[PDB]
Paper text:
The structures of the tip before and after interaction with FhuA start to diverge from BHPpb3 distal domains. More precisely, hdI and hIV overlay remarkably, with an RMSD of 0.85 Å over 244 residues. However, hdII and hdIII rotate around the long helix of hdIII as a rigid body (the RMSD before and after opening of hdII-III is 0.75 Å over 367 residues), and the plug unwinds in a long β-hairpin. These conformational changes result in BHPpb3 trimer opening, creating a channel with a constant ~40 Å in diameter from the hdI-hdIV ring to the hdII insertion tip. The three β-hairpin legs connect BHPpb3 to the nanodisc: Their tip is composed of 233-Leu-Phe-Gly-Leu-236, which would insert into the outer leaflet of the lipid bilayer hydrophobic core. In the crevice opened at the interface between two BHPpb3 subunits, extra densities were identified, in which the 43 C-terminal residues of TMPpb2* could be modeled. These densities merge with the ill-defined densities of BHPpb3 β-hairpin, strongly suggesting that TMPpb2* continues toward the nanodisc along BHPpb3 β-hairpin, forming with the latter a three-stranded β sheet. TMPpb2* is in turn expelled from the tail tube and anchor its C terminus in the crevice created between BHPpb3 monomers upon opening. Its hydrophobic segments would then insert in the outer membrane to form a transmembrane channel. Thus, T5 tail tube is anchored to the outer membrane by both BHPpb3 and TMPpb2*, in addition to FhuA-RBPpb5: It ensures that the tail tube is locked in register with the channel formed by TMPpb2* in the outer membrane.
Author numbering:
A (entry chain d): 529 to 720
B (entry chain c): 1 to 720
C (entry chain i), D (entry chain h): 1085 to 1127
Write the structure that this text describes.
Amino acid sequence: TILDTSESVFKNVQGILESFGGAINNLSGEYRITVEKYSTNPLRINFLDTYGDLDLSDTTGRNKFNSVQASLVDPALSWKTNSITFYNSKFKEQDKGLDKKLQLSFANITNYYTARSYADRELKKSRYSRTLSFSVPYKFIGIEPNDPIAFTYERYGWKDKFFLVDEVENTRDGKINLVLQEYGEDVFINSE
Amino acid sequence: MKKILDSAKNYLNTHDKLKTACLIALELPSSSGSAATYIYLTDYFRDVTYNGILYRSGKVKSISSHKQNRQLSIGSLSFTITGTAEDEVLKLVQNGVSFLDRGITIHQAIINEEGNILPVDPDTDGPLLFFRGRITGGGIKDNVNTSGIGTSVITWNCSNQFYDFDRVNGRYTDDASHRGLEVVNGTLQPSNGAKRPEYQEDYGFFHSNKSTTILAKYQVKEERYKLQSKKKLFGLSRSYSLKKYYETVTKEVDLDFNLAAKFIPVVYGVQKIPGIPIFADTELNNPNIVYVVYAFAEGEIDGFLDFYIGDSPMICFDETDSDTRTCFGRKKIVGDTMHRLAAGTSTSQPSVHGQEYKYNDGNGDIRIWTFHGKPDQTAAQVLVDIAKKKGFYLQNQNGNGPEYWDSRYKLLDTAYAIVRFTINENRTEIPEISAEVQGKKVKVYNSDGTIKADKTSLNGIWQLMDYLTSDRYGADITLDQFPLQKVISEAKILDIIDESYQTSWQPYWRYVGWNDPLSENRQIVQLNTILDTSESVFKNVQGILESFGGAINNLSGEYRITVEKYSTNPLRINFLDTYGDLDLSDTTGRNKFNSVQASLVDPALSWKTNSITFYNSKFKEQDKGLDKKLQLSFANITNYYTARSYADRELKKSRYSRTLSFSVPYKFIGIEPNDPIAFTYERYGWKDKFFLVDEVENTRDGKINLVLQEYGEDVFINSE
Amino acid sequence: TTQYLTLGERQKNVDVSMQASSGELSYLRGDKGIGNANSFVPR
Amino acid sequence: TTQYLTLGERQKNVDVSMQASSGELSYLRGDKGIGNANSFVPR
């Protein structure tokens, strides 16, 4: 990383985080830095524990991606930029050949293979996506964003289905609004 | 408009209680795709049997309204499913993602008093198709409130027929893709992905995508031994050093051939396109002879007109240009093509399939073989003969035998050209090649029934029809989804003779798509299109339609290609037939336009854009001198006069415009966009005023929302 | 003595669906070899 | 032998209100003649 101190520290922190898809949150006076990782001990939430209202939505159509442009700098070429494009052929075939590129920050990355693995991992991860949102009582206080949730709901086929928090809102009445995020299978950095 | 059976109109007029039912046929994802299982549904209170398919009742709570307008866009429809059903909730929750891009076909069915389906559609004597497309989303909302009644609604999001236009369908020079080889997983393996069954045996695109950058060493039979043509001044003295004759000597050549895999284009007129080198090589012994095969256009092609060797064409544009460099004939007035070289002082005519042209010029000589695309054409005989003798250096370096260029390399449906350069001290390298090619052969459907596909056509309607009926490089739409008569009439409309100029005013007639210097070829619109298949077919269709201001709509399953035009038989609508809601709005102030910037490539000079601005002085004076430019596409037009007439016509048409929106009962079912409406309303003073349908929305209840458009007098292409 | 013939440009598109290989590094940096971005022999 | 004096640049603005003419083609392609875009004599 080259951290041009002229830019605001906010921008620099965001640039560093975008490299590995991490996230920094400050809830309850803790500067928690976390990344989308698989967890073997999620918090168990049932529909009955949740408030009545539920909402499941699908965003796969919008977020399907099959290519990415990588303007990574190469030390071999006197530290000049290479316009390298990574695309998943199978995804394009499943996309009717349409090109769907995702803006990915390849700065502060010089190892080509790490860049390629990062690109392929992001493309794989961006294939399945749903947004499940509901409301939980004050008993479940402290649910940080990007936290592992095991949501169980008998009416569906969900038994401790693995979700990831995406947006936690705390109110003064105690009602906590959540917006989870469903992912594919074994698509996380931590997973096999 | 979509005419419906007469009995349908009689029933709709007579009967005031219509028991409409919507029949939904949905495609379930499953293995064994040939065994494609469908789930049928309907919102009628009882199961409806239609053509041996039983549409189960229930599970369908509501259906949204289909909407379309004169601008091509992916329409969207959403219908709901009862969330209390177990099958549907499980399907959406645990498979709602696998349902993406799966077909759905909603039919609108009127039920007789005896439970039978009234045959509205004349094409099948069945229902009138309401929607067709592919699912694109999901969503379920389980809303539970204590002390009350909960709610569980499943919502399915869909896109209309035009979602099939997001595909990019273009032949790709890579061997693996063209031949249909399976996606390689370790070793390679053939599959059934070929567009045509005969492609699999076509190895033509072999050696396509590779980068042979090596320091090759060649053996040149020269400058090592034998008699040398050097005689000293003295009578007896002689040069004992023997050279300048055939004998091996080492020589290092640093070749760098980077043959990439670029999408092949499609040309529908006299347009200049570059080459996509698919095979490169040099002779085994002489590095100075290099063979490079370039891919141009697709399908059977009328032939090449001229070749551009490094920005310098083989034929000089005018009298003036001939002095600057060597040329052969003119293009300004004689307008001869490349075929003069083989047949000197002949007529103008495109090249010949499998004929060699020896373009002799300063800096060296060039041999060109013009292989027009063909559905079944043999391999390049010259290359095969050379391969049999192992004359190619890279053939021997890689060890390949007589199969390096075998008889099986029959490039099918590709108008490639073999160019043999003779590298010398003047032509020290291989320059990028471009050519002027006539368009693909295009079918023209005469009204009587006979067709003719023996030449390319400049008509926009027929070019779009050809692009929309070819599976290998276009949208796989069968001809049986098109109303032939209406398409033919529209093609005639775009062939109206334009009298704003003479044929003698445009000198570069041969290179603007005119096949004859005398016969009448002042068509109102003439599009010389380059269809770069890299882009989505959606964008290509939109670009073609923007050239003549047409519009494509698919309501009721028929693809309508229509253009704003006057009609002598409009549909008559009286206000009392309306639901009584009315809204007249004025848009002239916003849509006033008085100038347009035309960036068009002019063949007279080496094909390059001319930034030409067309403006109407009177309109600017009315506009108080203020400039108002409408973005108008001139990419597909090379004839200056057609571009000017198009610009003036649009500027005139952009001076009077109102939007009139109302509603109409189900009696008037089948009002396509861009339809002629004669709206009579005596209170306003309107007696059969002429409007054009801009937006039509179909609701499940039968209410047909409309947004008509009003135009000034005689502003249409038809008559003045 | 030394003569060089050139044509086209290297294609930087990489298909990440296939397993990684050193041929990609050789191709992307302009090494002298024979093959595509997805299969390159560097000599 | 030959001497050239140059000044200005041709104006590509065309007034479509008036009828079309060959002078426009001559003027818009850089032909030698006397006149403007809306009225050009090409010699």
